[model samples]
Every structure is written in structure tokens, then in C-alpha cells.
Target: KVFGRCELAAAMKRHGLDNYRGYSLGNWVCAAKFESNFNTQATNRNTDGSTDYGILQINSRWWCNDGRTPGSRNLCNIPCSALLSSDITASVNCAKKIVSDGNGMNAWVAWRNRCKGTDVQAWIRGCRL
Candidate 1:
């Protein structure tokens, strides 16, 4: 389920995500890869989508879930099927907003760095530059 830059780049381009910031693509791809191996159906009932759960590997409790919140669509905290629909670009944009605030950027960096890494480790390693 590992996704390289080319594949992601094509996906991005097809999704009309040419406007995405340079560093952000790597970050988003990494989270998506690590979370569900990029699998859209990937689901984690353990925390009820509390921890890194979904295509972007987003956590519900903190990001969007907070089930206790009143009148909340909860989409922000959920796996967000729409995020992984045929409109992959839309999903990518939504992901950018979710983690662009700051904290999520770290995870994104790690993912992108791996993608650009030259050396391959026991694991699949990262994507392209």
C-alpha cells in the first residue's frame, strides 16, 4: 500500500491539486500511506476513529470527532469517505486544511521526507522528492 511521489503526483494532478504547497503533498501522502496503506476502506473501531484512523490517518477525538460536541457534522473527525472519493483532489485539499494548522505539519514532513529519502530501510521507506 506504499505510495510514491509519482503516483501521488499523478493523483494530485488528476485531482487538480496543482496549487498545493510543495511540502504539504509529502506530508499528506505519508499520513495516508501509514494510516491505511492508502486503503479507503481502512477503519479502526478500537478508539472509534479516535486515534490515527482513516485514509489520511486522521484522529477523531482531537481533529473532528469529539462525539460530545453538539451540532457537529463530525465529518472532520471521521474517516471521511468523501475525502477518498473519485474526487481525490478534493480529498487532498480537505486533508491539507485538517493538518496545515501546525501540529499535523510535523507528521506531514516526516511522511514527505520519507518519500524523498534516497536510502531504503527494512520498511518501504518514503516517497520521491
Candidate 2:
């Protein structure tokens, strides 16, 4: 939760995520802003009995699952709670897996609705990193 936009960008770039998966850092940052406002502890329960976790809001349907939920693929092999931490390496790693699987940022609905095809350069306007 310590990261704001610029701070998150630096961390993401340090982890080689600046433009990974053919998407820009602006797309990632913008999506995170809309998804969880960069708050690592954010969680949202969906109407379908699923939950989204962490800044990227990884869903319980096909992604990680806390034991309380049923029918999760757990493709990332990490607990859903792991994504809800200030240390975002695990979440980012899992996100990398999601992007590699072919959806790109399309896996995140926020990216599609808010960031896709939109001029997002302003997301990183003041961040020099």
C-alpha cells in the first residue's frame, strides 16, 4: 500500500515489468489505479461468490483462491491472500503468468474498460523513472 503511481512504476520497472507482455507501464499503472487504487490490501467480493485480490485484483474464479472459496484453478500456485500484501513480487509474478497465457491486460477488466485504446501517457507524466 506504500506505493503511489510513481513509486509503483519504479518498483514495476525494477522487476522488469515496465513493458512486459507487450503492454506499457502506463497501461499497468492505469489499470492498477482503477482496480485497487494501488492498495495492496484491497479485496472485492463478486456477485458470483468469487473474490478479487490485491492491486491487480486477481480473481478467485480462475486465479488464486483462499481456502474458503470453492472451485479455483490456483494457476499461480500461491494463496489469494499472498496477493494482498505490500510486497507485490508474488502478485506481479502471478500477473506475469496471466499475461503470458495470452490475455495480455485483457485479463483485467479495468484495463479493457479504462485503459484500452486510451491515451494514458499522463499516468506517468511526473514519474521520471
Candidate 3:
């Protein structure tokens, strides 16, 4: 499922991400935009032989099991396909836990390169949050 920014913002806010784990809503939105463009079916193969899953692009290296992707830590204890679901709750919870582990959004290269110091407010523009 591909979501509009407003739709995504509202969903993230409702999921307690307006300021989740000390990260702003805009930060989450911005990262997701760079990671997956809010598409639930998104996936990417990394050079490290891991795969990224879902809107946040959570990695198979540490967060999920893609079966074919070797060396997955599967810390989130979920199948990679689960992260691709349109429901999004599992992905969100996993992301919160990931940040809590101290990586913050720095876990995502996209966030590091694009969102960390930029004008992320555009991600939440026109949203009710």
C-alpha cells in the first residue's frame, strides 16, 4: 500500500509517533519517504547480502527473517513478509524498539544522509498533527 503524506502522518500520529522515542514525527516521515516512499511492499537488497523491508526499510540483517537472506539476526522475531503488510503496526513497534536500542534513526542510512539535519517539516506539512 502506498500512502499519501497526510495519510501517513495521521497514521503515524495515531500510532504514538508524533514524538516517539524522542524522534519527531517529521523525522519518521522523512525517513520513511527516503526509505520506501510510504509503500508497504517496498524491499531492497543491500550489498551486505541483507534485505530491507517495509516503509521504514527495516533490515533483515538484524530485524527480520527473509528466509533466503543469510545471517539475519531476526531480532524483531518476525518474518520479513510481515513487515510488508499494509497494517504497519508491527513495523512501527519494531522501529521503536530498534531506536530504543540506541541506534536511533541512524540505523537507516537514508535518514543519516537525508533527514538528520534537513528541513523535515515538509514531511508533515498540511497534516493535522
Top lDDT prediction, candidate number: 3
Off by over 4 Å in 2: none
- The positional error of residue 77 in candidate 1, measured at the CA in angstroms, is 8.6
Per-residue lDDT, model 1, residue 10, is: 55
- Residues 3-118, model 1: lDDT tens digits: 44457655755554443545434444554565567665455644343534446655455444545433445544444444445335445655666555554445543365554452
lDDT string for model 2 (1-129, tens) is 747888888788788887897788888888888899899999999888889999999998778978766787889998898998898898889899999888789889998999998987678878979
Candidate 1 regions with alpha-carbon error over 4 angstroms: 1-7, 15-19, 24-27, 48-53, 65-81, 84-90, 108-129
What TM value does model 3 have? Answer: 0.93
After TM-score superposition, the amount by which residue 66's alpha carbon in candidate 2 deviates from its true location, in angstroms, is 0.5
TM-score of each: 0.52, 0.94, 0.93
lDDT of each: 0.49, 0.86, 0.89
Off by over 4 Å in 3: none
Model 3, range 1-129, lDDT digits (tens) per residue?
A: 998898888888899987787888999899899999999999988888898899999989888888877776888899989999998898998898899888888988899999999988888988876
Candidate 1 global CA lDDT score: 0.49
- Clash-forming residue pairs, model 1: 27-108, 64-77, 65-77, 114-126, 114-127, 115-126, 115-127, 115-128
lDDT of 1 at 17: 40
